[PDB]
Paper text:
[name] from the Gram-positive [name] is an integral membrane protein that mediates the Na+-dependent binding and uptake of 5-aryl-substituted hydantoins (Suzuki & Henderson, 2006; Weyand et al, 2008). [name] belongs to the nucleobase-cation-symport-1, NCS1, family of secondary active transporters (Weyand et al, 2008) found widely in bacteria, archaea (Ma et al, 2013), fungi and plants (Mourad et al, 2012; Witz et al, 2012; Schein et al, 2013). The structure of [name] comprises twelve transmembrane helices (TMHs), which include the ten core TMHs characteristic of the superfamily with an additional two at the C-terminus (Weyand et al, 2008).
The structure of [name] in complex with L-5-(1H-indol-3-ylmethyl)hydantoin (L-IMH) was determined at 3.4 Å resolution. The L-IMH ligand is clearly defined in the electron density, residing between the bundle and hash motifs (Fig1A and B). L-IMH binds in a more extended conformation than was previously modelled for L-BH with the hydantoin ring reoriented by 180°. The hydantoin moiety mainly interacts with residues on the hash motif. It lies approximately parallel to the indole ring of Trp117 such that the two aromatic groups form a face-to-face π-stacking interaction and appears to be oriented by hydrogen bonding interactions with Asn318, Gln121 and Gly219 (Fig1B–D). This latter interaction with Gly219 at the breakpoint of TMH6 on the bundle was not apparent previously. The indole moiety of L-IMH packs between the main chain of Gly219 and the side chain of Gln42 at the breaks of the bundle helices TMH6 and TMH1, respectively, and forms an edge-to-face π-stacking interaction with Trp220 (Fig1B–D). Trp117 and Trp220 sandwich L-IMH in the binding pocket. In the IMH-[name] crystal structure, there is very limited space available in the region of Gly219 such that substitution of this glycine with any other amino acid would result in a clash of the amino acid side chain with the indole ring of L-IMH.
Author numbering: 11 to 466
The structure:
């Protein structure tokens, strides 16, 4: 048996996130340094308005993906890590999940770094003392302790950060434009003086940004509010209402701040607004500096925990259920995370983001397909928490599913600028015959699936 209180499905009465709250989480979750860089570097290949469009487009495909990847977690309250057990093995799932927990972990140490940079700047702008690693640890630690409070903290922290972050951001655009004596419309076409990159791969970069979160949203949305006595059409509007809430959360947030990163690049040659505003205005007071850094910190805190630390936590406490608990998995994830020292990753994000999409495109495709197409939303919680059942396949691993992943990954390389969308579509479609084959050896349903409601 693999069940423990932390890795257990989330009971209807325990659920706490409705549609407004999820929008309020996503809005603050999208406001984070990294998109300055991405949208900034994009000004190299396109002008600002197109970048904004590549952002809105990439945001929209992500949401279309969310509508599907979130449906089982909302309805059944389950983990990502737990949910992967279905198509891949009970243990075989650990392979893609380890890939993904690693990715997830990589982002955590990265943003902790950016956060640390911020706190260290506030202090050295007061005390001149400029030790970074200590502020690294201290921040990693603080996140761990606020993450102990799971989604309860996340949800309260993001509702108050959101408008503040929204305001700090709208202010930023006024200060730049003003101090440079430029209208909004003028800046809207200042970029793109070195074309070469296709616009599709631009969209693919901003999708590649959130692919990890989208593919494992479970860990957030297993906390969402559901009415168990809906219907097919009421369950679908529920899905659509949530997906819509995520759209209104990540789009308007990441457009304003994507634009800020782009504007910085194009006005002054740097994606970082500290520099761009400092120059254009010719220095700023120590308060107003400290301020900016308070922003960065507030913008990191609203993204890192929820987006980067939750899912490996749940991976530990759900694979080693008597060894780890949520809180302990949080401690082990933030330590490994920082010990990956990701701040030394050479290159630029864009290509990394191009890496992230074509690497998880089939994973999202296989999960959407197994649950929606193969099984028809008809799942067995019982067997998900037991070493030997209908999801055990060949001694814990479903090799045919690991094959479909490879194959789809291959075909993906035949269309480099759309890698992700072919690999998703390929994995999606192949899972069907592959699964109609595996179904001749192993059963797709179980009697114990009638105990589903016992869990809830
Ligand atoms: O899956 C992810 N977890 C993270 O922290 C990053 C977030 C992230 C990094 N770069 C971006 C550019 C645009 C939008 C989001 C991002 N991606
Ligand atoms: Na944030």
């Amino acid at each position: 048996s693999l069940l423990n209180p932390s890795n257990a499905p989330t009971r209807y009465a325990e659920r706490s996130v409705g549609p407004f709250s999820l929008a309020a989480i996503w809005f603050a979750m999208a406001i984070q340094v990294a998109i300055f860089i991405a949208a900034g570097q994009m000004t190299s290949s396109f002008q600002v308005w197109q970048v904004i469009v590549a952002i809105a487009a990439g945001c929209t495909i992500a949401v279309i993906l969310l509508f599907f990847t979130q449906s089982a977690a909302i309805r059944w309250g389950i983990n990502f890590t737990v949910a992967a057990r279905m198509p891949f093995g009970i243990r075989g799932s650990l392979i893609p999940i380890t890939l993904k927990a690693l990715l997830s972990l990589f982002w955590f140490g990265f943003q902790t770094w950016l956060g640390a940079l911020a706190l260290d700047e506030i202090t050295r702008l007061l005390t001149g003392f400029t030790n970074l690693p200590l502020w690294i640890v201290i921040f990693g630690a603080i996140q761990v302790v606020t993450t102990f409070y799971g989604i309860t903290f996340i949800r309260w922290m993001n509702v108050f950060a959101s408008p503040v972050l929204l305001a700090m951001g709208v202010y930023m655009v006024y200060l730049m434009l003003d101090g440079a004596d430029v209208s909004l419309g003028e800046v809207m076409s200042m970029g793109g003086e070195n074309p070469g990159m296709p616009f599709s791969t631009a969209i693919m970069i901003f999708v590649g940004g959130w692919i990890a979160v989208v593919v494992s949203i479970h860990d957030i949305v297993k906390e969402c509010k559901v009415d168990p006595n809906a219907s097919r059409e009421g369950q679908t509007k529920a899905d659509a209402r949530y997906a819509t809430a995520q759209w209104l959360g990540m789009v308007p947030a990441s457009i304003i701040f994507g634009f800020i990163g782009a504007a910085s690049m194009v006005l002054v040659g740097e994606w970082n607004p500290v520099i761009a505003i400092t120059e254009v205005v010719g220095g700023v007071s120590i308060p107003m500096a400290i301020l900016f850094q308070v922003f960065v910190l507030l913008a990191t805190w609203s993204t890192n925990p929820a987006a980067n630390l939750l899912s490996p936590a749940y991976t530990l406490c759900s694979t080693f259920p008597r060894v780890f608990t949520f809180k302990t998995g949080v401690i082990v994830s933030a330590v490994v995370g920082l010990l990956m020292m990701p701040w030394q990753f050479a290159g630029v994000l864009n290509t990394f983001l191009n890496l992230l999409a074509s690497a998880l495109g089939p994973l999202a495709g296989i999960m959407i397909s197994d649950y929606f197409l193969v099984r028809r939303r008809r799942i067995s919680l019982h067997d998900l928490y037991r070493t030997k059942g209908i999801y055990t396949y060949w001694r814990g691993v479903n090799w045919v599913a690991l094959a479909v992943y490879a194959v789809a990954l291959a075909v993906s390389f035949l269309t480099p600028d759309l890698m992700f969308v072919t690999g998703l579509i390929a994995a999606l479609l192949l899972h069907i015959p592959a699964m109609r084959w595996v179904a001749k050896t192993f059963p797709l349903f179980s009697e114990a699936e009638s105990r589903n409601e016992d869990y809830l």
